[PDB]
Structure formats: structure tokens, C-alpha cells
Swiss-Prot record:
Its main location: nucleus. It comes from Homo sapiens. Keywords: Cell cycle, Cell division, DNA damage, DNA repair, Hydrolase, Isopeptide bond, Metal-binding, Mitosis, Nucleus, Phosphoprotein, Ubl conjugation, Zinc, Zinc-finger. GO terms for cellular component: fibrillar center; nucleoplasm. This is DNA cross-link repair 1A protein. Disulfide bonds: none annotated. Belongs to the DNA repair metallo-beta-lactamase (DRMBL) family. It is found in: Nucleus. Binds constitutively to TP53BP1. Binds CDC27, which is itself a component of the anaphase promoting complex (APC). Binds PIAS1. One of its GO terms (biological process) is interstrand cross-link repair. May be required for DNA interstrand cross-link repair. Also required for checkpoint mediated cell cycle arrest in early prophase in response to mitotic spindle poisons. Possesses beta-lactamase activity, catalyzing the hydrolysis of penicillin G and nitrocefin. Exhibits no activity towards other beta-lactam antibiotic classes including cephalosporins (cefotaxime) and carbapenems (imipenem). Induction: During mitosis. The mRNA encoding this protein contains an internal ribosome entry site (IRES) in its 5'-UTR. This 5'-UTR generally suppresses translation while specifically promoting expression during mitosis, when cap-dependent translation may be impaired. Expressed in brain, heart, kidney, liver, pancreas, placenta and skeletal muscle. One of its GO terms (molecular function) is 5'-3' DNA exonuclease activity.
Length: 341
């Protein structure tokens, strides 16, 4: 059954709850963003109102084939009424189209559900500055102090220089970027841009990117592999045998692959800076794992929560075991006592 942390008290609203069949008493299904753990269960046959960003709407319509009459896109940063209840959608700094949702309850409670987010100080000067928030439904993916990672800007800087140098040293080297979902487009876009190329990809991935209101996108991507020296591939295929394979298919147009695996956290975050990264090499094929996160570090999360000073926090990630739950509750208490709310 749909868990309590997917229900918004005193509404008939649910968030990211599509895989439980009809939820008894739900009048409106919110979707924070187009990732499959969140949309799981959506399809052309769903016949209940879905509320979401314009971008997420474009993806429901063109990739899942949900019928237009059920998609209610809302602009961001705009006070809107949904079945008699004031709501605001805010940028979640996660993947394209991803949102946080502010709920103003008829009783006077204000609730924020973060969906998936990467907390940023820029959120402190949005519509959230303007009033008190009583309840926080929090993306707790990296709620533990070992989880450090660099800024997105640091990581992109590294990837750009790495690729530019390898391609200038050898003009017959190919760049491959792994992907399996929306998000992290800046990786392959910044690389392509420094090398004077469009990015090449399959037809299914091209369709997905054409939904995302990226400015000047027709100038940046293509379905023509031959014409492009940055290739996107399924993340599954980013390994030595699967690259070699791919390298055969290019027909002697390239002799070397330089490949990037945009991971989240991996344990060498605890010992190594971005400046001192190295790849796995098997011949002319090299694979960088780069820690580009679209989830809050432990410190970024801490800061956002200490600024907000919510009265109650309800975790939406890592809730399945009593030990995770217990550990999270301890950090929330430390934060509260340190900050005096
Ligand atoms: Ni996500």
C-alpha cells in the first residue's frame, strides 16, 4: 500500500505514487520529475489528473504516451490553485523539469516536498524566504557525513580539460559518455562544445532530449554518429568489451575511446580530490568515473535544513530499514540543537 510519506495530509493529494493502483481518496497525482522510480506505473491508460512541470508534461506525452487531457503542467514560481488549494512549483536543481512543491493547507499549515533535489543557497532567495514552513518532506539520499562531493562546476571543468587534451594529442580519438535517464546533460554538452562538435546518439535518446526546452538544442545534438566526435551510449555498454564492440562499428574512423561514467558517490570521494583522478585503461580504451551529483551532499542538505528551520522532517529516501531511519533521526536532532530551532 501507498506509504504515509507519499501522502499530503488534509488534501486528497499524493506525490510520486503511481505504482499502487488507485489510491483510496486521491483526487490529484503530483509528479516531481521524470525518473522511473518516481513515475513507475504511469502509461497511456492512466485516467486521473497528473500535475507537473511543463518539461515533465512533454515527457509524459511523448515517451509514455499519456493522453493530453490528463496532464496539467504548471509554471514555476507562480501561485496556482489545485482543487481549492494554493500550490507553488520551484526548481529542484536535480534533472531537467524536476520540481519541489509548496503546499498551503486550508488549516494554515505550509508543507514543502523537495522531490529529488540538490540543495543550493540560491533557494534561500526564492518564494521560500517569504513564510514559515511547518513540515518538510526531504530527499535524504546522501544523509551521512561521509558523503562529500565537488561542485558541479568543478566536475565539468575537469571533464572539459581531460577531453580537450586527449583529442588534441590524438585527433582520431572518440569520446563516449554513458547515460540511462535524463539528468547530467551538462557533462556531454560542455565536452561537445569545447571540441566543436554536436553530440551523437540513438533515436530514442534524441527524442528524449528534444522534450527538454533546452535553448538552441537543434544546434547541439544529432542522430548522425558519423558527423560527431562525442557519442552517447547506454551506461550498460560503458565497459571495455562493450566499447571495443562500439569501436568496431565506427569503421576505422577512430583508434582510441575516451569514455566518462558520471557516477553519484563512490568510496574514493573519501580519499581523492577531483584534480587527482585517474582512469581504468585496457589498451587504447580509457574510462573515467566522475562524481557528478544531482543530489545534495551531507553539508548542502544540512545548510538548507538549518536555514529553513522546519518543525517536522519526513524522509523520502533510505526509509526501508530501521537502522537507516534511526541514523537519519539522530542527524536531524544534532542539526536542530546546533541551530536552536
Ligand atoms: Ni531522481
Amino acid at each position: 500500500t501507498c506509504p504515509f510519506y507519499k501522502k499530503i495530509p488534509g488534501t486528497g493529494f499524493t506525490v510520486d505514487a503511481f505504482q499502487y493502483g488507485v489510491v483510496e481518496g486521491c483526487t490529484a497525482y503530483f509528479l516531481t520529475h521524470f525518473h522511473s522510480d518516481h513515475y513507475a506505473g504511469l502509461s497511456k491508460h492512466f485516467t486521473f489528473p497528473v500535475y507537473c512541470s511543463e518539461i515533465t508534461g512533454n515527457l509524459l506525452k511523448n515517451k509514455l504516451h499519456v493522453q493530453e487531457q490528463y496532464i496539467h503542467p504548471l509554471p514555476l514560481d507562480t501561485e496556482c490553485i489545485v482543487n481549492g488549494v494554493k500550490v507553488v512549483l520551484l526548481d529542484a536543481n536535480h534533472c531537467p523539469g524536476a520540481v519541489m512543491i509548496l503546499f498551503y493547507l486550508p488549516n494554515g499549515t505550509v508543507i514543502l516536498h523537495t522531490g529529488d533535489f540538490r540543495a543550493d543557497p540560491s533557494m534561500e532567495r526564492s518564494l521560500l524566504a517569504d513564510q514559515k514552513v511547518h513540515m518538510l518532506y526531504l530527499d535524504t539520499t546522501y544523509c551521512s557525513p561521509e558523503y562529500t562531493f565537488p561542485s558541479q562546476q568543478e566536475v565539468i571543468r575537469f571533464a572539459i580539460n581531460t577531453a580537450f587534451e586527449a583529442v588534441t594529442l590524438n585527433p582520431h580519438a572518440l569520446v563516449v559518455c554513458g547515460t540511462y535517464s535524463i539528468g547530467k546533460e551538462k557533462v556531454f554538452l560542455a565536452i561537445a562544445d569545447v571540441l566543436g562538435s554536436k553530440v551523437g546518439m540513438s533515436q530514442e535518446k534524441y527524442k528524449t532530449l528534444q522534450c527538454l526546452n533546452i535553448p538552441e538544442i537543434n544546434s547541439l545534438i544529432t542522430t548522425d554518429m558519423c558527423s560527431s566526435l562525442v557519442h552517447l551510449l547506454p551506461m550498460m555498454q560503458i565497459n571495455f568489451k562493450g566499447l571495443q564492440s562500439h569501436l568496431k562499428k565506427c569503421g576505422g574512423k577512430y583508434n582510441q575511446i575516451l569514455a566518462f561514467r558520471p557516477t553519484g558517490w563512490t568510496h574514493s570521494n573519501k580519499f581523492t580530490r577531483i584534480a587527482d583522478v585517474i582512469p581504468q585503461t585496457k589498451g587504447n580504451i580509457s574510462i573515467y568515473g566522475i562524481p557528478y551529483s544531482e543530489h545534495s551532499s551531507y553539508l548542502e542538505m544540512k545548510r538548507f535544513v538549518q536555514w529553513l528551520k522546519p518543525q517536522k522532517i519526513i524522509p523520502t529516501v533510505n526509509v526501508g530499514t530501521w537502522k537507516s531511519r534511526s541514523t537519519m533521526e539522530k542527524y536531524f536532532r544534532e542539526w536542530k540543537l546546533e541551530a536552536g530551532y
